[PDB]
Amino acid sequence: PKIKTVRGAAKRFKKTGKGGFKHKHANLRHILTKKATKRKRHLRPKAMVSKGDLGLVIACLPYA
Amino acid sequence: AHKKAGGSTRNGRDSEAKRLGVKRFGGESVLAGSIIVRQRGTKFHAGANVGCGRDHTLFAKADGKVKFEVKGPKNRKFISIEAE
Amino acid sequence: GFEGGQMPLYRRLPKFGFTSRKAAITAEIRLSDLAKVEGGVVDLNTLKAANIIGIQIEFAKVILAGEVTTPVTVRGLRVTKGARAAIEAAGGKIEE
Amino acid sequence: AKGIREKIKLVSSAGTGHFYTTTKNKRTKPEKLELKKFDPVVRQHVIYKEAKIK
RNA sequence: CUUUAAUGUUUGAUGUUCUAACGUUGACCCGUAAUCCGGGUUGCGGACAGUGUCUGGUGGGUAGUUUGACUGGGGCGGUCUCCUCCUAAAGAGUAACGGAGGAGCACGAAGGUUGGCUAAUCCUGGUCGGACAUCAGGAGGUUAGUGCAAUGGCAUAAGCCAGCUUGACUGCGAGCGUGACGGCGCGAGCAGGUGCGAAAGCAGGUCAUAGUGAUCCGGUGGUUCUGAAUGGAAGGGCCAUC
RNA sequence: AAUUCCUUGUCGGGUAAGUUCCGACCUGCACGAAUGGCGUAAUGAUGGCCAGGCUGUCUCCACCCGAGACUCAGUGAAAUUGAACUCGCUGUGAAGAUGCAGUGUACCCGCGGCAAGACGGAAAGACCCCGUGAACCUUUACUAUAGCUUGACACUGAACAU
RNA sequence: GUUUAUUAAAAACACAGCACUGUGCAAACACGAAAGUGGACGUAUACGGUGUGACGCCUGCCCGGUGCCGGAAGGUUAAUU
RNA sequence: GUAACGGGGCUAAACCAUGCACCGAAGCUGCGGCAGCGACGCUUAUGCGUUGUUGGGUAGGGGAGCGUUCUGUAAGCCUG
RNA sequence: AGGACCGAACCGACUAAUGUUGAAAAAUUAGCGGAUGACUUGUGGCUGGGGGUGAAAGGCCAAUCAAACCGGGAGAUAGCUGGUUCUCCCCGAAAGCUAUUUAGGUAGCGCCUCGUGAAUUCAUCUCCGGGGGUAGAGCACUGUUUCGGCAACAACCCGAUGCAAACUGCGAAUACCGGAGAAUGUUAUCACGGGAGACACACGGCGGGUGCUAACGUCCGUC
RNA sequence: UUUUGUAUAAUGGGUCAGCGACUUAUAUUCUGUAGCAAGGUUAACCGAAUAGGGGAGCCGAAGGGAAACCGAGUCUUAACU
RNA sequence: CCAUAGGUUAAUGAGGCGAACCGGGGGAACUGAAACAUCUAAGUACCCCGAGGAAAAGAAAUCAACCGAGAUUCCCCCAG
Ligand SMILES: [Mg+2]
Ligand SMILES: [Mg+2]
Ligand SMILES: [Mg+2]
Ligand SMILES: [Mg+2]
Ligand SMILES: [Mg+2]
Ligand SMILES: [Mg+2]
Ligand SMILES: [Mg+2]
Ligand SMILES: [Mg+2]
Ligand SMILES: [Mg+2]
Ligand SMILES: [Mg+2]
Ligand SMILES: [Mg+2]
Ligand SMILES: [Mg+2]
Ligand SMILES: [Mg+2]
Ligand SMILES: [Mg+2]
Ligand SMILES: [Mg+2]
Ligand SMILES: [Mg+2]
Ligand SMILES: [Mg+2]
Ligand SMILES: [Mg+2]
Ligand SMILES: [Mg+2]
Ligand SMILES: [Mg+2]
Ligand SMILES: [Mg+2]
Ligand SMILES: [Mg+2]
Ligand SMILES: [Mg+2]
Ligand SMILES: [Mg+2]
Ligand SMILES: [Mg+2]
Ligand SMILES: [Mg+2]
Ligand SMILES: [Mg+2]
Ligand SMILES: [Mg+2]
Ligand SMILES: [Mg+2]
Ligand SMILES: [Mg+2]
Ligand SMILES: [Mg+2]
Ligand SMILES: [Mg+2]
Ligand SMILES: [Mg+2]
Ligand SMILES: [Mg+2]
Ligand SMILES: [Mg+2]
Ligand SMILES: [Mg+2]
Ligand SMILES: [Mg+2]
Ligand SMILES: [Mg+2]
Ligand SMILES: [Mg+2]
Ligand SMILES: [Mg+2]
Ligand SMILES: [Mg+2]
Ligand SMILES: [Mg+2]
């Protein structure tokens, strides 16, 4: 049995219409957001490419 | 918090200055022209200065937008390719 | 097993909160099949072959998807315009 | 920085609506007073007396 | 009834004495021609001592560990982030314990807009000067002033003054620049409501570039997103923020 | 000075000549009073210096007596060892060459004797650095804990004075 | 006198003597989860621990620091209610 | 131990200029052969002859194979 | 009488030689210290490993001691060293960047290889459109520096001369950017995906920091 | 072998013979190949045991949102862009 | 005084070995976390007691979700 690293799950678990699970975004939030207005919109998440491969291993059967 | 010792060995880790967006490209609302960073309005650049000055973009899409103030403030006019 | 450079850190940055829909999964019933391997009694609960809800569940709600009926006392509690207007060649029903 | 003497944080607030808006201020420099406008959840501006009202 | 005094009391305190738990490494009697042990009598001590649970001390007696790197060996010294200039070969970028400095802020205004205004310095004059003080004309040309380094920039002034204000707005964003990535920056235009201007229009903080800390664990406010039989609730999410 | 860095301090003594030694001075880098101070007869396979005697320690080695070394008969090891058809010199070159280049030289093979090269043999450097090694050891490093101590409640009761 | 059996025999360890300190006996202290045992079939002229190391003449000033000894009124303070 | 032309030895066997000739490598050409790919000739699952070209190679990637012990095909075949 | 004297046994080990593949895993030879004492020795007994014993050296506890020997957890862990076996054919690196208790390790990017796609994408050259402040030069500015003209001996201004990484009122080559065009190269180009290795590079030329225009020196750039 | 680099005087081997190191299990993902196809496939177990039976269940034909929820849409926003 | 304590006799029975599985009492560290205290290794190693042919568990103060299932045990799923 392969144990998915439960951490990354809570972190970037997803799978758009084609893998590339959309991680997440946000920076300084919930610490220092008393700075900047515009450059701070949660918008939504996004994934990567140079890094995706590493974040790939979790999931298997579609869960949530 | 003593990291004071002159030595004069100390960087800057410089960025952005570059003259990217050289000449009159095909266009696109791309940056092209930044130098000092800040920047504001610009529109279809025309390259300006004073005395000598006045570059002549001539080619862009419809709103270059870039050049702060060290290189020909604002720009744009009636120039596109055929007209504007 | 010498994954020197644990994947975690440097990849492990920013981690949004989240929870879980206690809905089992609320399978949609299905690809707009209702009625026909659906026991042809059109309603829906579980003993099916071609398209099945799989039973362990709370509610359904069918999307409309593949090819529809020709007969269909559609129930399943459930909904969608995909449903009301495609399955509509027959048997409305929704109930609760 | 977080010297109880210089710049602090201004939680700020509005009049009925439960908004926020934050910024910085001081202490020794005239304070115990504040109010601007800023735009709330929606609609008009007005009020936003924040903390330290006139 | 209460503010308050005496008696009854209940109960917490110290202190007195008692025997009866408890101790006795005192004596004597049996088991027993045992120094053990047990029983008994007797003495002395006595709710103490001591034990168990809990709890504050102290605790290298013992135990497990930590005690960075860069470095012209190492060590001593110095430096480990960010901003400016030279190196940096006229697009980016590129090193050295290379040559020089700055940041870890400030600002109800030092922001916005509208209207308006332009240095420094010297010469000749001028009471209170005898180098420079406010005045007058003249020469008056980035040699001024930019909130703080350096570079770049600045008269359409960003430099200076005053009136009115809160755009240091909320929701989005064509398309770009820059990064291995996390991320960082620029941004016309759109929607809702603003301020300043007759108006065109300007404003999404400061002339720009430093003034910064990811995640986790939580704290505060908002919301019927969720809430383990159900209705709530706790808790979780989401948004704002510490 | 078992303590003095400057240092062979300075003066005296011993010596033909004494960075040691003995006696002074005091300028104690950086003695000092039970982590004892200054003395001290006796003792010492204890450190330092001087003398007499004695001598091959030496000037400078000579001879001699024995046990090996050498030769024969018997038995019969050792470490080491990529392969050898295993010379000198100057240069070269991963930087000190039997092996490369140039050159010189050298019939073939033993035995005794010596060690100057084979960076000779031996032992995966004991020094030095490094490893997010190890061990013991130290403490006002950290985190625990035995032990020694504190009080609360228990085993634990009876009355009385305040 | 003792010591590094197998590179150190010494100026080192010990020593008798001295001093400080602790211990009232079920002693302090030590071995031991405990029972028990040693100390001692001893009992302060005794036993332990620490330092100095015959003997001679001596052993000065500092109690700020740390440690220890006494006080414990007042401040701070655990479990517990 | 010549050891500051490699030695010899050199008055030009040095240098400077000018021009021709010769030596000289796995470079190129000639001749034969091998393999991959594009083409050509055809033939045409295909394939072969001509031709142009490609074929140094550590880490490493890809692609083909030989051989061994054991199992099936095997009381078949080989063998006193 | 005496931890008294001399000296065999007995006990011990201060010195030198020899031995050092020994006669010997500590001895032999010649000397040496104690030798009625804290002496020396036979037999048997008691202390056990974080434990013992120790006139104290970390000494001794069976040729073992800053924690004995034997068996086990055990194939501890080893980012380190070594080693890794048949053959032919094609392609073919890197020794960089960015992080890193990281620096002789890793990880993303870069570069290798294999697959699938995609456009007259790629590249050299010709012309066209671009920005530049390097070399060189210059001395209006910043700052050095002279020499000559006006300062109870000199800044300041005029003429003549230099110097500069952090000077520029000038300014190449040239590299880089985009646009067309012919030709050539078995898409050389880009994207996505499988497997990588690789982050010690050394020398030579040119441009430079350093260092002494020292070094088979050291750190960048480029070929 | 290790290196920028070794005839190196750097490492290893006296010689021969035999043995001596990328395996194995399950999981996941690519590639080739075979089966079937919007469907593919069974597990344990039963068993006239490699059959046949068993479709519990796993994967795919739907996705978006933190979720309720909606659904070829959906989130985002008061927004229908 | 009684009565007990103790003593004698006699009949039953135990005692010790034993490979593993099993119940139970006590219980590491290397290791991993690229350091290390929480955490891991693992209730594993080990040591001790006990019993069987198997032991153990076992007929709901179980679960479910307004429908219902129905003691324990072992197997595949739910699910990494
Ligand atoms: Mg089913
Ligand atoms: Mg310790
Ligand atoms: Mg450990
Ligand atoms: Mg270091
Ligand atoms: Mg440049
Ligand atoms: Mg350049
Ligand atoms: Mg005047
Ligand atoms: Mg500014
Ligand atoms: Mg003297
Ligand atoms: Mg004293
Ligand atoms: Mg003494
Ligand atoms: Mg002989
Ligand atoms: Mg020689
Ligand atoms: Mg030589
Ligand atoms: Mg010899
Ligand atoms: Mg040697
Ligand atoms: Mg070594
Ligand atoms: Mg003696
Ligand atoms: Mg010895
Ligand atoms: Mg000795
Ligand atoms: Mg002493
Ligand atoms: Mg010829
Ligand atoms: Mg040839
Ligand atoms: Mg090849
Ligand atoms: Mg005697
Ligand atoms: Mg010798
Ligand atoms: Mg002797
Ligand atoms: Mg004697
Ligand atoms: Mg004995
Ligand atoms: Mg021994
Ligand atoms: Mg293990
Ligand atoms: Mg091992
Ligand atoms: Mg770190
Ligand atoms: Mg120049
Ligand atoms: Mg590295
Ligand atoms: Mg490197
Ligand atoms: Mg380099
Ligand atoms: Mg070099
Ligand atoms: Mg080397
Ligand atoms: Mg060798
Ligand atoms: Mg062999
Ligand atoms: Mg670890």
Swiss-Prot record, chain A:
Q: Which UniProt keywords apply?
A: Ribonucleoprotein, Ribosomal protein
Q: Which residue stretches belong to region Disordered?
A: 1-21
Matching PROSITE patterns, A to Z?
RIBOSOMAL_L35
Basic residues compositional bias, start-end: 9-21
Record-linked Pfam families: Ribosomal_L35p
Please verify whether the record's keywords include S-adenosyl-L-methionine: no
Listed under GO biological process in this entry are: cytoplasmic translation
**Disulfide-linked positions:** none
Molecular function terms in GO for this entry?
A: structural constituent of ribosome
InterPro entries under this entry? Ribosomal_bL35 (IPR001706), Ribosomal_bL35-like (IPR021137), Ribosomal_bL35_CS (IPR018265), Ribosomal_bL35_sf (IPR037229)
Q: How does it assemble?
A: Part of the 50S ribosomal subunit.
Query: Family assignment?
Result: Belongs to the bacterial ribosomal protein bL35 family.
Protein name from the UniProt record:
Large ribosomal subunit protein bL35
Origin organism is Escherichia coli (strain K12)
List the taxonomic lineage.
Answer: Bacteria, Pseudomonadati, Pseudomonadota, Gammaproteobacteria, Enterobacterales
Curated annotation (Swiss-Prot), chain B:
Q: Which organism is it from?
A: Escherichia coli (strain K12)
The GO molecular function terms of this record are: ribosome binding; rRNA binding; structural constituent of ribosome; tRNA binding
Region labeled Disordered — which residues? 1-19
Q: Provide the assembly information.
A: Part of the 50S ribosomal subunit. Cross-links to the 23S rRNA. Cross-links to the A and P site tRNAs.
Protein name in UniProt: Large ribosomal subunit protein bL27
SUPFAM superfamilies assigned to the protein according to its UniProt record, in alphabetical order: Ribosomal L27 protein-like
Q: Which UniProt keywords apply?
A: Ribonucleoprotein, Ribosomal protein, RNA-binding, rRNA-binding, tRNA-binding
Q: Which family does it belong to?
A: Belongs to the bacterial ribosomal protein bL27 family.
Primary gene name: rpmA
Q: Which PANTHER family match?
A: LARGE RIBOSOMAL SUBUNIT PROTEIN BL27M, RIBOSOMAL PROTEIN L27
Superkingdom of origin organism: Bacteria
UniProtKB/Swiss-Prot annotation, chain C:
- A GO biological-process term: cytoplasmic translation
- Does the keyword RNA-binding feature in the UniProt annotation? yes
Classify the source by domain of life.
Bacteria
Ribonucleoprotein as a keyword of this entry, yes or no, is yes
Q: Tell me which stretches of the chain form a coiled coil.
A: none
Query: What does the entry list under GO cellular component?
Result: cytoplasm; cytosolic large ribosomal subunit
Molecular function (GO) terms listed?
A: rRNA binding; structural constituent of ribosome
The entry's keywords = Ribonucleoprotein, Ribosomal protein, RNA-binding, rRNA-binding
Question: Of which family is this protein a member?
Answer: Belongs to the universal ribosomal protein uL15 family.
Described function: This protein binds the 5S rRNA. It is required for the late stages of subunit assembly, and is essential for 5S rRNA assembly onto the ribosome.
Subunit composition and interactions:
Part of the 50S ribosomal subunit. Contacts the 5S rRNA.
Protein's name according to its UniProt entry: Large ribosomal subunit protein uL15
Q: Which organism is it from?
A: Escherichia coli (strain K12)
Which taxonomic lineage is given here? Bacteria, Pseudomonadati, Pseudomonadota, Gammaproteobacteria, Enterobacterales
List the range of the whole protein covered here. 49 to 144 of 144
UniProtKB/Swiss-Prot annotation, chain D:
Q: Per the UniProt entry, what are the Gene Ontology biological process annotations, in alphabetical order?
A: cytoplasmic translation; response to antibiotic; ribosomal large subunit assembly
Q: Does the keyword DNA repair apply?
A: no
One MF term in the entry's GO annotations: tRNA binding
What are the entry keywords?
A: Methylation, Ribonucleoprotein, Ribosomal protein, RNA-binding, tRNA-binding
What Pfam families does the record tag this protein with?
Ribosomal_L33
Q: Which residues form a coiled coil?
A: none
Under the heading PROSITE patterns, the entry gives: RIBOSOMAL_L33 (PS00582)
- Check the record and name the InterPro entries matching this protein: Ribosomal_bL33, Ribosomal_bL33_CS, Ribosomal_bL33_sf, Ribosomal_zn-bd
| Disulphide connectivity of cysteines | none
Q: Gene Ontology terms, cellular component aspect? A: cytoplasm; cytosol; cytosolic large ribosomal subunit
Q: Which residues carry this modification: N-methylalanine?
A: A1
> Would you say which domain of life the source belongs to?
Bacteria
Concerning its family, UniProt says: Belongs to the bacterial ribosomal protein bL33 family.
What HAMAP family does the record tag this protein with?
Answer: Ribosomal_bL33
Q: What else is known?
A: Surface exposed on the 50S subunit.
Provide the assembly information: Part of the 50S ribosomal subunit. Cross-links to the P and E site tRNAs.
**Name of this chain's protein:** Large ribosomal subunit protein bL33
* Name of the gene: rpmG
